[PDB]
Each structure stands twice: as structure tokens, then as C-alpha cells.
Amino acid sequence: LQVCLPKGPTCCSRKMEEKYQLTARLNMEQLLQSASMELKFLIIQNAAVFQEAFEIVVRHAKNYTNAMFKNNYPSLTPQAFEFVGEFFTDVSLYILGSDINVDDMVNELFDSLFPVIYTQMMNPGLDINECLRGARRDLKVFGSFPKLIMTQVSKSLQVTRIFLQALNLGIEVINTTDHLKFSKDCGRMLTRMWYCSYCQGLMMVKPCGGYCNVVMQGCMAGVVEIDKYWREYILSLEELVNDMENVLLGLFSTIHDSIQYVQKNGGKLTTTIGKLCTLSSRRRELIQKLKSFINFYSALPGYICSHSPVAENDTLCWNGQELVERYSQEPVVSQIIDKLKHINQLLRTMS
Amino acid sequence: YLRKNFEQDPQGREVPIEGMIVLHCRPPEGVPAAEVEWLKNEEPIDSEQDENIDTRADHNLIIRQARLSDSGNYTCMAANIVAKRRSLSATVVVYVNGGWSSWTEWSACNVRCGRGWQKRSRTCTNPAPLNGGAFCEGMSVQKITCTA
Ligand SMILES: *[C@@H]1O[C@H](CO)[C@@H](O)[C@H](O)[C@H]1NC(C)=O
Ligand SMILES: *[C@@H]1O[C@H](CO)[C@@H](O)[C@H](O)[C@H]1NC(C)=O
Ligand SMILES: *[C@@H]1O[C@H](CO)[C@@H](O)[C@H](O)[C@H]1NC(C)=O
Ligand SMILES: *[C@H]1O[C@H](CO)[C@@H](O)[C@H](O)[C@@H]1O
Numbered sequence: 389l390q391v392c393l394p395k396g397p398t399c400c401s402r403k404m405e406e407k408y409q410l411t412a413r414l415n416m417e418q419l420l421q422s423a424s425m426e427l428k429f430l431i432i433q434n435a436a437v438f439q440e441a442f443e444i445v446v447r448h449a450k451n452y453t454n455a456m457f458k459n460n461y462p463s464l465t466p467q468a469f470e471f472v473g474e475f476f477t478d479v480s481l482y483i484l485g486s487d488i489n490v491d492d493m494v495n496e497l498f499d500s501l502f503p504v505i506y507t508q509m510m511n512p513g514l515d516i517n518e519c520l521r522g523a524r525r526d527l528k529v530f531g532s533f534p535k536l537i538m539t540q541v542s543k544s545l546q547v548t549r550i551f552l553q554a555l556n557l558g559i560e561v562i563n564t565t566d567h568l569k570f571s572k573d574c575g576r577m578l579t580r581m582w583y584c585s586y587c588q589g590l591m592m593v594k595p596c597g598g599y600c601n602v603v604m605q606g607c608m609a610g611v612v613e614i615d616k617y618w619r620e621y622i623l624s625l626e627e628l629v630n631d632m633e634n635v636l637l638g639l640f641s642t643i644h645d646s647i648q649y650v651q652k653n654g655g656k657l658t659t660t661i662g663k664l665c666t667l668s669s670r671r672r673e674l675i676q677k678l679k680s681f682i683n684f685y686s687a688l689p690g691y692i693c694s695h696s697p698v699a700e701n702d703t704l705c706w707n708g709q710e711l712v713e714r715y716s717q718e719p720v721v722s723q724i725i726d727k728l729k730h731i732n733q734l735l736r737t738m739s
Numbered sequence: 740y741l742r743k744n745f746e747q748d749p750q751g752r753e754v755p756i757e758g759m760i761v762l763h764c765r766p767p768e769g770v771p772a773a774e775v776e777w778l779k780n781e782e783p784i785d786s787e788q789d790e791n792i793d794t795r796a797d798h799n800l801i802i803r804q805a806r807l808s809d810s811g812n813y814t815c816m817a818a819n820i821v822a823k824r825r826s827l828s829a830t831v832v833v834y835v836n837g838g839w840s841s842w843t844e845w846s847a848c849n850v851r852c853g854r855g856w857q858k859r860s861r862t863c864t865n866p867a868p869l870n871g872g873a874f875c876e877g878m879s880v881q882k883i884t885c886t887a
Contacts, residue, residue, distance in 0.1 A: 432860075432862065435862060436860055436862065439879075484870070484874050485868050485871065485874050487871055536754065550819075553867065553868065553869070556862070556863060556864050556867035556868070557867050557869065559862065559864040559867065560864050560865065560866055560867045562867060563864065719806075722806055722807065723756070723806045726806045726807075726809060726868065730809065730869065730870070
């Protein structure tokens with residue numbers, strides 16, 4: 389045998405020892421999953437809700453912009469629908485982590501908007517389109533409105549993008565916890581602590597509380613080191629919550645005022661161009677519920693021993709090899725810590 | 740005599756969390772042979788400090804896993820008795836691809852009698868995209884009509 393220390397005879401072979409080892413693996417995974425389930429479901433719920441809510445906000449803002457174009461500037465439709473749809477599509481693409489340039493979104497929006505304004509509103513009556521697109525930026529027809537919208541939307545979209553990525557990475561690491569594979573030595577120690585008593589013919593004897601403590605502090609030496617970075621993750625997320633709904637929803641008013649501004653100088657512009665050519669509540673409740681799990685990694689071995697069958701009295705208990713009267717006495721974790729350091733730096737910089 | 744122009748500048752690369760990347764550097768022509776030193780974000784790297792990074796006799800920086808040595812602006816610098824010469828900094832960014840999660844359980848039919856709904860969620864968290872990784876491809880929710 390390679391696990392059960394044979395002191396007397398033994399009622400189990402090597403294959404029964406392997407069966408006990410696999411059952412030890414399954415029991416450890418089940419205990420970790422039971423420890424992590426409440427937090428996993430909390431973060432999954434919040435991630436799903438925030439994702440759907442942001443998509444709803446973007447769709448509603450596109451709808452309101454399209455409706456205000458239909459009502460106030462029918463001469464700019466249906467071209468207005470095309471560039472508004474493209475703009476808010478790129479908005480959603482940026483929110484979901486795709487490489488999109490916010491300044492380029494706004495600049496393409498105004499580049500597409502100016503020629504139809506000139507042809508339908510200022511000079512009623514396709515090839516000259518690019519000359520108008522160039523004149524838009526060369527003559528600064530929209531004034532400071534493009535940079536105003538640029539900063540207004542970049543500031544909110546960056547914090548939203550990083551919020552979603554932080555929620556998803558928290559889900560990732562919490563799913564990794566209960567799937568953390570351990571050393572072979574720990575497998576044998578857990579098999580001894582939970583099952584090797586059955587090989588010696590004992591039926592209801594439980595392992596000593598102190599033996600469970602030494603075993604758990606033995607194989608969770610790496611997992612406990614995650615606690616610093618998990619605490620910093622929680623606190624940095626709290627730093628970030630202390631925004632995007634108001635901006636995307638006022639976009640239509642800002643665009644209308646920019647259109648008024650351009651139409652204000654139509655006299656000179658036409659001649660020159662003719663010549664030349666409940667959210668905040670949710671994130672607050674999320675942070676207040678997430679701060680209840682700041683001790684998750686430090687309390688984990690205590691959970692495994694307090695939810696496994698153990699003799700707390702350390703009397704008439706199993707010490708891994710014999711029944712005693714009293715007890716005598718990285719790679720995946722490295723990836724978890726790498727991603728936590730990354731997301732923590734990313735969080736702290738938006739502050 | 741030490742030359743200004745580097746024989747071969749390090750190239751910026753995109754590498755997954757597990758991918759391995761080798762940064763090549765050929766120092767400029769000079770007597771004696773230029774001493775190549777690697778600097779991560781204008782700060783030297785210690786080959787003995789980490790198993791993941793090692794410096795080769797032919798001036799190459801090999802990274803086995805993008806976990807123990809994450810992204811940065813790696814720059815190769817040749818030192819000689821004459822002077823020192825800096826190469827073009829390579830922007831090495833580690834990119835994490837989106838990976839689908841398991842199908843959750845079907846929700847109860849909201850309507851007690853007649854046409855009901857059953858939902859199944861599929862999140863992009865196994866693994867979750869990092870440092871501008873490609874997001875998960877396809878649908879996130881599954882809905883089926885149910886008759887109770
Ligand atoms: C916009 O809002 C109105 C309000 O009733 C609705 O009728 C219309 O279908 C909506 N359009 C879009 C594209 O959401
Ligand atoms: C962890 O992510 C994996 C993806 O294969 C999934 O199989 C599992 O159900 C997730 N974890 C939990 C604990 O629900
Ligand atoms: C690497 O080069 C880029 C070029 O934009 C620069 O923004 C950045 O400061 C450099 N270093 C770091 C730490 O990103
Ligand atoms: C998720 O979707 C399918 C599995 O159903 C695959 O194309 C791939 O593994 C993807 O990440």
C-alpha cells in the first residue's frame with residue numbers, strides 16, 4: 389500500500405485505496421463548491437443583470453436618438469438611422485471589450501452627419517461627399533461639440549467596460565477555487581484523514597480537529613496567499629463604483645444643439661463650401677454584499693474542517709494512522725494571483 | 740567602434756496566457772562584442788529571479804508562460820566599453836481568448852397555463868477575456884416555449 393500506513397492487518401487492498409483517494413478528491417471538490425456557491429451565484433446574477441441592463445440602456449438611447457431625428461430633422465432621415473445605428477453598435481462593441489476607438493466613433497458620426505445636413509438643410513440640390521467630409525474637420529463646423537461628446541462618453545464607457553471585465557474575472561477565479569487541483573501528498577493525507585480509518589475496520593470514528601487543521605493548513609498554504617489580492621480586488625471595485633445612463637441618454641440633446649450650432653453660421657458656411665467644393669442602487673447593494681465575502685480565502689480551511697466530520701474534542705479520534713485517546717500534533721494559484729494583480733492595477737488606475 | 744543601428748530590433752507580439760514567446764535581439768557591430776541586457780519598461784529583468792525568464796548566450800529572451808511575466812515594453816540594450824545603444828522597444832501584450840460556460844438549468848414557465856418560457860444562461864467567464872481578448876462568439880441566452 390502507498391497511502392494507508394499498515395500498523396496491524398488491513399481490510400482494504402491497493403485498488404480500494406485508489407477508490408478512497410478518488411472519493412477524497414470528490415469530497416474536497418464538493419466542500420469547496422459548497423463554500424463558493426453563494427458568492428459564485430451572487431457575482432453571476434450581478435454580471436448577467438448589469439450586462440443586460442447596459443444593453444437595454446444602449447438600445448433605448450439609440451431609440452431616443454432615432455426618434456428625435458424622426459421628429460425634428462426628417463430631412464436627415466433615413467441616413468440619420470444608418471450612422472446612429474453604426475455609432476451605438478460601436479458603443480456596445482466597446483462596452484463588450486472589443487478594440488474600438490471612442491474618438492473615432494464620434495468623428496465618424498460627425499463626418500457622416502455633416503454632408504446630409506449640407507445637402508438637405510442648408511443647400512437643397514454623392515460625388516462631392518468626401519469634400520464635405522474633409523470640410524467638416526478642416527473648418528471645425530461643429531465647434532467644441534465633438535470633443536465634449538468624446539470626453540463625456542469615453543469617461544463613462546471605460547469605467548463600464550472595466551467594471552464588466554472585473555465582474556467576469558471574479559467569476560473566473562471563484563470558479564477556479566472549487567476546481568483547484570492539489571498535491572499528491574495532500575491527496576494521501578486527505579484519504580488518511582477521511583477514509584483510512586475504514587481500512588483498519590473502524591465504522592464511525594472521525595478525524596481529530598487538530599489533525600484536520602494541520603492537513604488543511606498543509607495543502608492550503610498557497611490558496612491562503614490569494615487573500616491579500618482578493619481583499620485588494622474587493623476594495624478597488626469599491627473604489628471604482630464611487631454614470632453611463634445619463635450620458636448616453638443626453639446624447640440626443642447634445643447632438644441637436646450641435647446641429648443648431650452648425651446651422652447658426654450657414655450664411656458663411658454654404659458660400660465657403662460652394663466655393664471650396666436603479667443602477668446606482670444595484671452597484672451599491674453589490675458592493676455591500678461583496679464586502680461580506682472579503683474573508684473568503686482566509687476562512688476557507690476553517691470551513692473545510694468545520695463542514696467535514698471531525699472530533700472537535702480531540703478525544704477518541706483518528707490521527708491519520710491510528711485511533712488515539714488525544715492527538716499529539718502553485719501554477720493555477722499563480723495564474724489566479726497574476727489575473728488579480730492585473731485587474732487590481734486596472735481598477736486602481738481608473739481612480 | 741560601436742554602431743548606432745541595431746542589427747535586429749525586438750518585435751512586439753501578442754501571446755495567450757499559456758503561449759511562449761522569444762524576443763530576438765542582434766546587437767550592433769562593435770569591438771568588443773556588445774553585452775545585451777533586457778529592460779522591461781525601462782527597468783532591467785533578473786533571469787535568476789524567475790524560472791519563466793532566462794537569458795540566452797545568443798541574446799534571446801524566452802518566456803514560457805505569459806503568467807509569471809505579463810505584458811510590457813521590453814527593450815534590448817547593448818553595452819560596450821565605447822558606449823551604450825538602445826533598440827526599438829517591443830510592445831508585448833498578453834491577450835486572453837473568450838471561453839463559453841456550461842449551460843445552466845432551465846427556468847420555470849412564468850405562465851401557469853398556456854405559453855410559457857424557459858431560460859438558460861451561458862456566460863463568457865471560462866475563461867473571461869483579458870487585456871482586450873476576443874469576446875465569446877455566439878448567443879449568451881437560450882429561450883424555449885413551454886406548455887404547462
Ligand atoms: C421607440 O419608442 C416608441 C414608443 O412607443 C415605440 O413605439 C417604437 O417601437 C420604438 N422604436 C424602437 C426602435 O425601439
Ligand atoms: C465553472 O466553469 C466551468 C466551465 O466548463 C463549468 O463547467 C462549471 O459549471 C463552472 N462552475 C460552477 C461552480 O458552477
Ligand atoms: C509603452 O508605449 C506606449 C505608446 O502609447 C505608451 O503609451 C506607454 O506609456 C509605454 N509604457 C507603458 C507602461 O505602457
Ligand atoms: C463556445 O461554443 C462552442 C461550444 O458549444 C465552441 O465553438 C467553442 O469552444 C466556444 O468557445
